[PDB]
Every structure is written in structure tokens, then in C-alpha cells.
Amino acid sequence: HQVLFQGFNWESWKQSGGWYNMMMGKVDDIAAAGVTHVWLPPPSHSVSNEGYMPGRLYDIDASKYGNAAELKSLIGALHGKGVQAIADIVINHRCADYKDSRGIYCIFEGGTSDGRLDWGPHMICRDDTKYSDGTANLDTGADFAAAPDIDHLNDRVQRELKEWLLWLKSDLGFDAWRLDFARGYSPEMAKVYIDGTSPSLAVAEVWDNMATGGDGKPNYDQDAHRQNLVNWVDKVGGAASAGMVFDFTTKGILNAAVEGELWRLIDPQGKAPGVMGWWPAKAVTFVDNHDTGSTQAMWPFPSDKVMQGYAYILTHPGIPCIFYDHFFNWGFKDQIAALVAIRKRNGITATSALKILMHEGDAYVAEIDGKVVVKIGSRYDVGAVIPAGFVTSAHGNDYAVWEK
Ligand SMILES: C=C1O[C@H](O[C@H]2[C@H](O)[C@@H](O)[C@@H](O[C@H]3[C@H](O)[C@@H](O)[C@H](O)O[C@@H]3CO)O[C@@H]2CO)[C@H](O)[C@@H](O)[C@@H]1N[C@H]1C=C(C=O)C(=O)[C@H](O)[C@H]1O
Ligand SMILES: C=C1O[C@H](O[C@H]2[C@H](O)[C@@H](O)[C@H](O)O[C@@H]2CO)[C@H](O)[C@@H](O)[C@@H]1N[C@H]1C=C(C=O)C(=O)[C@H](O)[C@H]1O
Ligand SMILES: C=C1O[C@H](O[C@H]2[C@H](O)[C@@H](O)[C@H](O)O[C@@H]2CO)[C@H](O)[C@@H](O)[C@@H]1N[C@H]1C=C(C=O)C(=O)[C@H](O)[C@H]1O
Ligand SMILES: [Ca+2]
Ligand SMILES: [Ca+2]
Ligand SMILES: [Ca+2]
């Protein structure tokens, strides 16, 4: 059994009294709903308030989310309930605290008394000319424009980041990683850190453009999109690796599908169309996250159909990830908990078998492991499609779930 939970949103750093402190009061509801892993925000000092422009990595006390003692208390509470803690690891880029003689911010400070992470421009990809001194290796991946990109090919960098990562586990108690902007460095570099730190899981955020047509909607065929993600997993180590990816293919397709285009939820081979359909064990599915949803709203799930999104990911193969706001602030807490209970009670896992029974514009009906049937869509009556022996156990706006 495995169900992830994003424990924050874009506005979290603003929480009165501290985000982690408030989260102590949410622990029991999260665990009781069947969540196994909670993804927490970048915990270090950041030039930006949300944490994605990290500087002094060991300086946890400078985080807008709360200090090291407050974070420890939270993870301890999650552990007290059998819930693991995932840390958002932002290492593609980093901000240096001080300017060098060129007037460039490239003198880094790790946050400890000695020199760990006290890097200089030699650790910045030479092709990131805005900050480098031209001496480093070329970036192994994409560049993050607003900050110095790190040369993960550098010996000291790999050594010190790995040391920092092991510390996040030993000192704070973190169990796993969420690899931010994994497009920024090669899967080979991600393998160093994953293999080198033994996280329970390491979910990579590789987010690439999804092909669309003249009308702005994603093409029905998204194989190129999931192939890219599958390729990342293969390169990082495949089945043996703790590495996996967020299923952005499923997110993009589902976004469109629920607007009466449920025929999009099956590929020509009869499989789910997202990463879920090719490598379910490595597909972390979701309805929205802090970028796509929340206040950034980069690619929000149709607001009036969010529960169809959960009825879908919570009953299907792949590892579902619930978003904080959807659980506590949209009034779906009991419905979402009920869906997780059905998943768990039926032994459904990331590798369960999926048999799609109907895939028409306004009606998607699928059967999982021959034990659960789920339906989403504006079409009310799908009774004729329901196999004998099944009876409703959960239902809501345009969705219903059956059990034997
Ligand atoms: C059991 C059904 O559950 C789901 O239907 C929702 C529906 O989408 C909502 O819009 C809402 O409809 C209610 C209206 O709000 C109300 O004004 C009206 O008077 O009554 C309707 C019906 O309650 O609520 C329902 C219930 O949550 C789901 O989308 C739908 O497909 C599903 N029906 C299926 C299950 C059965 C066994 O209980 C069969 O009887 C049906 O044939 C089967 O399609
Ligand atoms: C905020 C995200 O931006 C990028 O994703 C873009 C995709 O590449 C593009 O295909 C799509 O059309 O638009 C996306 C949104 O701009 C990055 O690839 C992605 O990693 C990034 N999300 C994380 C990175 C940050 C910088 O550290 C943060 O601002 C985000 O909050 C992260 O979740
Ligand atoms: C399970 C496999 O998933 C991916 O393969 C997909 C291909 O990339 C895609 O082009 C093809 O059409 O569909 C495939 C999915 O059916 C990975 O590339 C592939 O490596 C992976 N197979 C590995 C995983 C295992 C456990 O799931 C092992 O038993 C296999 O031997 C691995 O090769
Ligand atoms: Ca130092
Ligand atoms: Ca950069
Ligand atoms: Ca990079």
C-alpha cells in the first residue's frame, strides 16, 4: 500500500505561527486517511520565501516554514503514526550568499562553521555565464535562469551534497526525496544522489512541454511525453533504483479528458495513456501540485471536477499523490479518505491490473484487479457496464466506485 501527500501549497510559508507547527494538528487526519508518505517543502534558507532558491543548505533555522526543532517535531509526529517524510530537494541551482571581486554572487556559504558547501564560482556550470568563472564543466541538464546552476560533475559537489542529504535523514529524520527541477541535470547525476543516499523513494519532477494541436488541447497521442519520462527512469537505474517520476503525462491528459473527453483515457493498446500505462510502479500521479494548482495556477485541474481526478488516481495503478488543499480546504476530506480506504482494503497497489470497461466522451469506467470498478463522467447511467456482483460503496459528483 502506498499513497503520497503533498504537505504544503504555495502560500504555506505565510502560515501564522509557522507551517510545520500548524501541520502538527493535521498529522492524525493525514495518517488516518491512509497516507504513507508526506512531501514537505525545501527546508533550508532560501533567497525566495517558498524555498526554491536555496543558499545555506544546512541553515534549516532560516526557513520561512519553521526551524529545525519545529521540523524535527513534525517528522517525529508523522513517524509516530507510520507516515514517512519526503524532502523537496532543490539542487539543480543554488544562490551564493556573497559577491566575489567581480561583483557577482558566487561565493557560497553552507550554513556551518567549516567549509562544507562553501563553494565558489568553480562549482557553477561554466555555461551559466551570468555567474560562472568559466572553469567548471558544462551543465548536465537545463539551466534555471534566476540562479547559479551547479556543476554536478564536480567531485566536491557530489561529495558534499550527498553528505548534506544523509544529514537531512540522520538529523531531521527525512526518509525520501522529491527531486526538484530534475530536468536541470542528467539522470546519471540524479543516480549518484539517489544511489548514494538510499531514500525509501526519490520522486523526480521532470516537467516537459506536452504536444498540443491547433485548438490548444493536448494531442490524443502522448507517447513521446511519457517516453521521455520512462527514458529518465531507465537511465537512473530502472527497477532497481529508488527513483521514479511524477506522471505529468497523466496530469496533462486528465486535465483535458474530464471536459467531456473521457475517450482520451485509453491508448490504442488498451492501456492508461500516461506513464501509469507503461511503468505504473514508477508513476506518481496527482491532480494538482503547488505549481499547477494553488495560487500559481500554472495548469489547474478543472475546478469543478477535482473529485473525478481523485476517483481516477486513487483507484488506479501508479502511486497517487493527494494535494493538501484538496484534502483539507475543498470539503473533500471524507470523500478522499473513503477512496483511499477502498484502495487499501482491496490491496490495490502501483502495479494493480487495469481493465478499462468504457471510454466514451462522458463516461470512463474501469475495473481494477477484478475487485474495484470506478466511473467518472457526466453520463449518469452506466449500470449496463457494471459487472455482476458489484455494488456502490462510494459516489459523488460525476464519479462512483463499486466493490464486490
Ligand atoms: C450512484 C451514482 O453516483 C454518481 O451520481 C451522482 C451525480 O453525478 C450527481 O450529479 C448527483 O446527482 C443527484 C442530483 O444532485 C439530484 O438533484 C437528483 O435528484 O438525484 C441525483 C442522483 O443522486 O448525485 C449522484 C450520486 O452521487 C455517479 O455519477 C453515477 O454514475 C452513479 N450511478 C450509478 C450507480 C448505480 C448503483 O447505485 C446505478 O443505479 C446506476 O445505474 C449507475 O449508473
Ligand atoms: C515551475 C516549474 O517550471 C518548469 O516547468 C515548466 C515546464 O518545463 C514546461 O514544459 C511547462 O509548459 O511549463 C512548466 C511551468 O513553467 C520547470 O521545468 C519545473 O521544474 C518547475 N517546477 C519546480 C522548479 C522551481 C525552481 O526551483 C520552483 O519555482 C517550482 O515551484 C518547482 O516545483
Ligand atoms: C516496464 C518497462 O517500462 C518501460 O518500457 C516501455 C517502453 O519504453 C515503451 O516504448 C514500450 O512500448 O512500453 C514499455 C512498457 O510496457 C521501460 O523502458 C522498461 O525498461 C521497463 N522494463 C523494465 C522493468 C522491470 C520490472 O517492471 C523488469 O522486469 C524489466 O525486465 C525491465 O526491462
Ligand atoms: Ca561555512
Ligand atoms: Ca542558472
Ligand atoms: Ca542545470
Swiss-Prot record:
InterPro entries: A-amylase_bs_C, A-amylase_pln, Alpha_amylase, Glyco_hydro_13_cat_dom, Glyco_hydro_b, Glycoside_hydrolase_SF. It comes from the Eukaryota. Its EC number is 3.2.1.1. Ca(2+) 1 binds at N92, D139, A142, D149, G184. Substrate binds at residues 45-47, 52-53, 178-183, 207, 209, 227, 234, 271, 277-279, 290, 296, 375, 380-382, 392-398, 402. Ca(2+) 3 binds at D128, D143, F144, A147, D149. Optimum pH is 5.5 with p-nitrophenyl maltoheptaoside or amylopectin as substrate. The record marks D291 as: Transition state stabilizer. GO terms for molecular function: alpha-amylase activity; calcium ion binding. One of its GO terms (biological process) is starch catabolic process. It is found in: Secreted, Extracellular space. It catalyses: Endohydrolysis of (1->4)-alpha-D-glucosidic linkages in polysaccharides containing three or more (1->4)-alpha-linked D-glucose units. Keywords: Calcium, Carbohydrate metabolism, Germination, Glycosidase, Hydrolase, Metal-binding, Secreted, Signal. Binds 3 Ca(2+) ions per subunit. Changing D291N: Loss of activity. Monomer. There are at least 4 types of alpha-amylase in barley. Alpha-amylase displaying a robust amylolytic activity toward p-nitrophenyl maltoheptaoside (BPNP-G7), amylopectin and beta-limit dextrin. This is Alpha-amylase type A isozyme. It comes from Hordeum vulgare.
